[PDB]
């Protein structure tokens, strides 16, 4: 009966009309690579040719993740294989209007991240015109993709960056209903509204603009996307007691610190016999918690990374962040703003080193995502 | 019926008694990490430290190999999951031999590959004193396998290099004991010897040695890592007929060209109503044949890798080739002299960028693989 369940992602397909793409609502598949493409030159340094090589790729693109949602890859390399949940979502960078000329056409909450003082960002790690993120529960699956989906728009489109990320396989899952943990052991996703919740709904949706120049993102969500080093060894010198202090959470059950099971509420007014507070005053939960940050909130769907060592023998692995919200100004910037002001524990043992912002529009019924953008 | 075949490779243990360790024989699980290690430089400068250090890593990668194959990793990683076939296996490079100054243990099986013509090795992604290959069905098993026993000799170890592969899931397989292709899109390790038969061991496992002093690696074997970028740009341009004249085996079936199956045997002397070769005279399966190499063969276990984009944009895409033998002189080496001399028709679609050799000794009762060099 888990039996099912456990097969129940390699087998299936993504529902392809989940909104406003697929990729953020649903069950996540347990791989993902996500791509950042700048545009071309010399079609890039001219806002007409800039406008027709957008329309050209985002048209290119939603004409194969229709058929690939449908059928999967068209290769040999995927022959054999089940449909893996594979899924396709499109979106656009600030600096794609910028290149069109079109800074009349850009939201609000496309500004441009701010910079933080924990940013350790290598800048060709960091931004884009043009963004995929492919999942599937299969790396064969996935790969076969994003080899098809790059090929295709391949020479208007150049890839900037890239990154690869897992979490467990469902197959190999006692409870494939259990939330995901990370390279520093915790379970990770706990505190996101939960997918049936209008509260979903809400938190990832971009509301109404009053500005109709900007109305292409009415109903869109706005991706935040972190490369964040996990600093290992120094994690593993701590004990076990020290690292759930860290976070607020039990590693064990994921409890937050002071209750007995992980969906208990966070209580962050307990405190011990002598008055200290249970959840320390620089535990990751307490900073990131909505009450801190003026009700902000979104919902993460991140994933884990492992480029094994680089040339010093330091481990390049962590998390692949990806924060979904209607408004980066009352999701990700906000409670960001507070991990790294307000001191979280965490920022010692993380090191942020990639980071773009990207608006995923909602397209209608025979569009592509962002032809109300181009065609505008 | 076919469901349990699909989640059986998650939900099983690997065989922690294959020989001459896990991770050569038996089903091959969906991913893999490979990594070398050299001795640090505090242990590695002075050959009573080196002796110390590598026993010092060899018996807790041992150690924790039995635990794992057991009972899993520790972490709480990766709670919550199932077995999923994991596997560690143990190896040595001559360079280890090198820093204990023990060479005269070095049989000639572990002497270095020759320079081809066609190599294109970065320095800093070949070589190493030690190995670990560690797989599983499942990434979030490996990963934490990975990381515990890379801290588990640290720091008498450092990473010299290490990649990262994968094949086909089980779970996602419509028949999950059909043979698994590359990212070219082929079917990959057909001609292996079948396992449960007399070739396969003859091909894997090193003979006696003639003199003591080599016998530590009686029953052992032989892996030559090769990580071979491929050129999928280029590839993409060939039509499927193209694709396969290079290979010299059907995409679809897998069959050899002239045949109907995958297990159809390979027919060199077949020519068409034209005089024309069926199989290219330079197609990879005719150059690679036993019989053009008076009898060399290797047991191929591979896993395709995806490492993005480099900055000059070139796809870091390819085969983690991995050939098992009793002695590469009888095995990889001889081929891949062939390949390179005879002009692979794959040669202009591959470019050979990391490279190894490590001695996997056989594992015995109470004892650590390479404790008979290392005492
Ligand atoms: C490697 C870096 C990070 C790690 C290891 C990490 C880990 C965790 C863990 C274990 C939890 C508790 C379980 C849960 O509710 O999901 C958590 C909660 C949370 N994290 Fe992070 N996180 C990281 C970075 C970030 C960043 C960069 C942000 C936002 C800017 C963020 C925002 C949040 C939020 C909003 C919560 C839920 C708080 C609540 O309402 O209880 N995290 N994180
Ligand atoms: C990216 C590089 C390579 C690719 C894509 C590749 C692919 C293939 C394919 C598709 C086959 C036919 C199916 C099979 O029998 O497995 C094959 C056969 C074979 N390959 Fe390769 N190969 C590569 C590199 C090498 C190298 C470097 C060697 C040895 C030095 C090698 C040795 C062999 C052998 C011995 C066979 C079986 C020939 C026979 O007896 O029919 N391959 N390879």
């Given at each position: ?170 197959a190999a899952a006692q409870d494939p209903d259990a939330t995901p943990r990370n390279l520093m052991g915790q379970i990770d996703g706990t505190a996101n509204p939960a997918q049936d919740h209008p509260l979903f709904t809400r938190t990832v949706t971009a509301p109404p603009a009053d500005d109709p120049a900007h109305a292409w993102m009415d109903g869109g969500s ?102 979904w919200q209607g408004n980066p100004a009352t999701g990700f910037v906000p409670v960001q703003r507070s991990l790294v002001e307000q001191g979280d524990a965490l920022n010692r043992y993380t090191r942020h080193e990639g980071s773009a912002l990207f608006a995923v529009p909602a397209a209608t019924a025979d569009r592509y995502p962002g032809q109300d953008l181009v065609?505008?």
């Open positions: 009966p888990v039996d099912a369940q456990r097969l129940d992602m390699a087998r299936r397909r993504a529902d392809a009309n989940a909104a406003p793409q697929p990729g953020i609502s649903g069950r996540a598949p347990a791989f993902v690579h996500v791509i950042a493409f700048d545009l071309a030159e010399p079609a890039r340094a001219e806002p007409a040719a800039a406008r027709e090589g957008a329309a050209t790729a985002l048209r290119t693109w939603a004409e194969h993740a229709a058929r690939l949602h449908a059928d999967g890859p068209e290769g040999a390399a995927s022959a054999g294989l089940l449909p893996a949940s594979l899924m396709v979502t499109i979106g656009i960078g600030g600096s794609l209007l910028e290149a069109m000329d079109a800074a009349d056409r850009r939201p609000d909450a496309l500004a441009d991240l701010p910079e933080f003082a924990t940013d350790d960002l290598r800048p060709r790690w960091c931004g884009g015109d043009l963004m995929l993120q492919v999942g599937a529960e299969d790396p064969m699956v996935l790969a076969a993709a994003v080899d098809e989906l790059v090929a295709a728009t391949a020479p208007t489109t150049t890839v900037r960056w890239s990154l690869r990320g897992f979490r467990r396989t469902a706005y991706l935040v996307v972190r490369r964040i080093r996990m600093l290992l060894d120094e994690w593993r010198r701590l004990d076990v007691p020290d690292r759930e202090r860290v976070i607020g959470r039990h590693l064990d059950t994921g409890a937050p610190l002071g209750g007995e099971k992980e969906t208990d509420p966070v209580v962050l007014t307990a405190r011990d016999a002598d008055g200290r507070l249970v959840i320390p005053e620089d535990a990751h939960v307490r900073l990131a918690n909505p009450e801190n940050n003026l009700g902000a909130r979104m919902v993460r769907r991140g994933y884990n990374y492992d480029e094994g060592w680089r040339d010093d023998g330091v481990r390049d692995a962590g998390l692949l962040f990806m924060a065609e505008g």
